[PDB]
Design a protein around this ligand. Structure first.
Ligand SMILES: Cc1cc(F)cc(C)c1-c1ccc(C(=O)O)s1
Ligand SMILES: [Cl-]
Ligand SMILES: [Cl-]
Ligand SMILES: [Cl-]
Ligand SMILES: [Cl-]
Ligand code: NI
Ligand code: NI
Ligand code: NI
Ligand code: NI
Length: 266
């Protein structure tokens, strides 16, 4: 059995806006969640993402290939430890957000290794920076199948001089929410399902934005809880922006679908 055969790239999950339905989007998010988790670490019915410490590099990333009606394709790279986009490939070029630390900087050298042209943005992929570059808040950027179709084209046309940085940043904001944040939250997945079901494009309201902002804090609160009870409340927001507190994991079980690993399971 002399000659060894190796895999040549990370797992790929495909989604196209051309013919997208509630069902095809649901199947896509379900498959992304299935690739992000082992299903062996589930706490209070909420799957936990793999622990970064000691994670083999061939387990570190998954690829999401997006296509639209123009058959333009871009491939996003997601870090399985936090479900978040670290960069993307369009044709012969790959673009990475500035890594948050040297560990992540090392990991992304393993991505898209056959690509001819590699680039790193000086800015990270966090919403605060992307909003500044886009000149627009998440609150003012429409989401839906139409926005996603446009975002795919903008990412694709960045290499050949079409797309400018403000539009690129806006397009990242769209992709990250419709893929990463939907994978993280059944609530945000459901918001996107409703937009697709009724052919709507609307910006996310404060309940979505505050969940996105609070995902890391919710993961810590749940994993360090006492039988699901938080030592201190987490403050979230309703659709109209009014604040409210969550004291226990039970109300979050239909809301959050994935958590970043914080500590070992019991
Ligand atoms: C009930 C709940 C528990 C959570 F842990 C997080 C959220 C965002 C919610 C909301 C669902 C709908 C809301 C509205 O209609 O304002 S608030
Ligand atoms: Cl529980
Ligand atoms: Cl490094
Ligand atoms: Cl542009
Ligand atoms: Cl522990
Ligand atoms: Ni730097
Ligand atoms: Ni904000
Ligand atoms: Ni702990
Ligand atoms: Ni623990």
């Amino acid at each position: 059995s002399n000659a060894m055969i190796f895999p040549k790239q990370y797992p790929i999950i495909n989604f196209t806006t051309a013919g997208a339905t509630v069902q095809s989007y649901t199947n896509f998010i379900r498959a992304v969640r299935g690739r992000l988790t082992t299903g062996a670490d589930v706490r209070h019915e909420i799957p936990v993402l793999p622990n970064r410490v000691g994670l083999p590099i061939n387990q570190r990333f998954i690829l999401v290939e997006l296509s639209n009606h123009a058959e333009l394709s871009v491939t996003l790279a997601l870090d399985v430890t936090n479900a978040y986009v670290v960069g993307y490939r369009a044709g012969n070029s790959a673009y990475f957000f500035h890594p948050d630390n040297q560990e992540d900087a090392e990991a992304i050298t393993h991505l898209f290794t056959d690509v001819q042209n590699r680039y790193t943005f000086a800015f990270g992929g966090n919403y605060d920076r992307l909003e500044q570059l886009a000149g627009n808040l998440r609150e003012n950027i429409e989401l839906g199948n139409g926005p996603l179709e446009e975002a795919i084209s903008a990412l694709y046309y960045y290499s050949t001089g079409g797309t400018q940085l403000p539009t690129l940043a806006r397009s990242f904001i769209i992709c990250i929410q419709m893929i990463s944040e939907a994978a993280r939250f059944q609530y945000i997945e459901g918001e996107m399902r409703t937009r697709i079901r009724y052919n709507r494009r609307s910006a996310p309201d404060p309940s979505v934005i505050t969940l996105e902002n609070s995902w890391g804090r919710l993961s810590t609160a749940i994993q360090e809880s006492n039988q699901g009870a938080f030592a201190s409340p987490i403050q979230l927001q309703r659709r109209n922006g009014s604040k409210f507190s969550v004291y226990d994991v039970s109300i979050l079980i239909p809301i959050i679908a994935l958590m970043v690993y914080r500590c070992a399971p019991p």
